[PDB]
Amino acid sequence: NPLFSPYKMGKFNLSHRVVLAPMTRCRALNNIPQAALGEYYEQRATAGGFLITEGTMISPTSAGFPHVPGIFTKEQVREWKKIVDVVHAKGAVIFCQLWHVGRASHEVYQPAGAAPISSTEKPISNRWRILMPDGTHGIYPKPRAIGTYEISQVVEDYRRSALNAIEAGFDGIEIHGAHGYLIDQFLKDGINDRTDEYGGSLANRCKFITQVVQAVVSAIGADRVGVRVSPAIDHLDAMDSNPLSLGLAVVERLNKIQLHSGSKLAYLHVTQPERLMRTLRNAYQGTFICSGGYTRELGIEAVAQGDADLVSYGRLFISNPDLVMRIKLNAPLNKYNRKTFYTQDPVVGYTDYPFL
Numbered sequence: 001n002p003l004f005s006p007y008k009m010g011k012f013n014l015s016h017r018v019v020l021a022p023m024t025r026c027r028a029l030n031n032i033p034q035a036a037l038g039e040y041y042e043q044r045a046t047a048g049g050f051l052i053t054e055g056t057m058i059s060p061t062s063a064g065f066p067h068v069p070g071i072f073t074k075e076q077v078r079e080w081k082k083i084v085d086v087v088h089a090k091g092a093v094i095f096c097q098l099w100h101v102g103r104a105s106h107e108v109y110q111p112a113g114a115a116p117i118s119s120t121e122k123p124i125s126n127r128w129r130i131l132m133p134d135g136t137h138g139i140y141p142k143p144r145a146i147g148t149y150e151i152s153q154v155v156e157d158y159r160r161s162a163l164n165a166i167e168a169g170f171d172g173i174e175i176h177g178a179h180g181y182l183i184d185q186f187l188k189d190g191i192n193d194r195t196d197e198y199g200g201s202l203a204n205r206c207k208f209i210t211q212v213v214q215a216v217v218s219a220i221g222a223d224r225v226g227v228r229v230s231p232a233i234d235h236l237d238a239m240d241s242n243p244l245s246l247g248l249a250v251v252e253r254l255n256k257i258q259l260h261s262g263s264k265l266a267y268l269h270v271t272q273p274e275r276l277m278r279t280l281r282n283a284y285q286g287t288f289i290c291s292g293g294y295t296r297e298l299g300i301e302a303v304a305q306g307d308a309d310l311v312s313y314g315r316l317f318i319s320n321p322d323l324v325m326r327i328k329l330n331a332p333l334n335k336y337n338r339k340t341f342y343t344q345d346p347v348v349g350y351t352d353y354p355f356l
């Protein structure tokens with residue numbers, strides 16, 4: 001089974017290629033990482049296995065889901081440290097995904113009920129609704145389009161959060177540049193209507209992600225930085241007229257960051273909607289994680305055919321804490337319950353999915 005050949009993700013030698021994809025679960029009450037998170041990640045950790053945490057806030061203005069963890073305060077650092085220690089005691093490698101939702105927010109999630117920030121003042125259209133803290137769904141508001149000074153401040157928030165993640169003991173961080181969130185609101189020409197140096201051409205639209213990645217690379221080292229993008233996913237009104245071109249343009253800038261820094265990133269992580277994946281892999285000089293709809297058989301095939309070095313699983317990892325072992329044994333998998341993806345119980349639908 002090619003998923004069980006070892007792989008060197010730079011200075012981290014992984015024992016197998018099954019990766020826990022980042023998944024928002026909303027158990028981090030009041031943005032504090034809770035003991036429940038430690039139990040959840042511990043159940044899924046394996047010796048030499050790689051885990052990516054749920055999206056984690058970089059600033060008070062970065063959230064658009066309830067009870068998502070932050071890593072911008074020293075209190076949050078202390079609590080993450082307890083979780084990282086538990087996962088490291090099982091021999092796993094763990095990266096913290098840094099997440100800013102941009103315009104995908106609501107007054108209820110913003111300090112003082114302020115408008116969320118974006119590249120644009122265009123709101124997400126009414127076809128999408130936001131999950132509210134009470135479990136209902138609300139309307140995405142009009143965001144505030146930020147100037148270039150504020151862009152530099154957001155980059156600094158990523159930089160400080162990356163340093164905080166290292167202080168908590170994380171092996172690295174992943175930049176969430178996917179799924180229509182803040183970075184994707186700069187990348188995608190269906191969203192980015194700017195006429196300044198951050199809008200228009202591919203080079204201008206890639207400026208923000210480039211500056212974010214460079215900032216965190218300078219702060220913690222390229223080999224501790226992964227990058228996640230989704231050029232072909234149009235979630236939250238995040239379409240590009242030419243997804244393949246956009247994906248290749250991002251890869252270009254990542255390859256250049258690696259040359260100028262003299263080191264490789266930890267990986268590029270691309271997720272697809274339920275030949276583009278292979279094309280970006282072929283263009284990128286480094287480790288590639290594929291994601292989106294992978295099964296045991298499709299993951300085996302992806303590694304065997306050279307389409308990816310690592311394969312990340314999301315929904316099946318929700319309901320199969322021992323997903324790695326089930327893939328190894330070709331054991332039957334447990335169903336997942338969508339109703340408890342984003343609820344707040346520390347156990348129900350979170351840690352009570354059974355082992356083999």
Ligand SMILES: Cc1cc2nc3c(=O)[nH]c(=O)nc-3n(C[C@H](O)[C@H](O)[C@H](O)COP(=O)(O)O)c2cc1C
Binds near residue numbers: 316
């Ligand atoms: C409940 C849920 C939460 C998710 N949260 C995140 C997230 O925080 N960051 C991210 O990049 N992707 C997130 N995703 C997308 C997944 O990481 C993954 O790419 C997606 O589920 C497709 O892979 P799969 O077929 O293995 O589930 C989430 C998906 C689900 C279903």
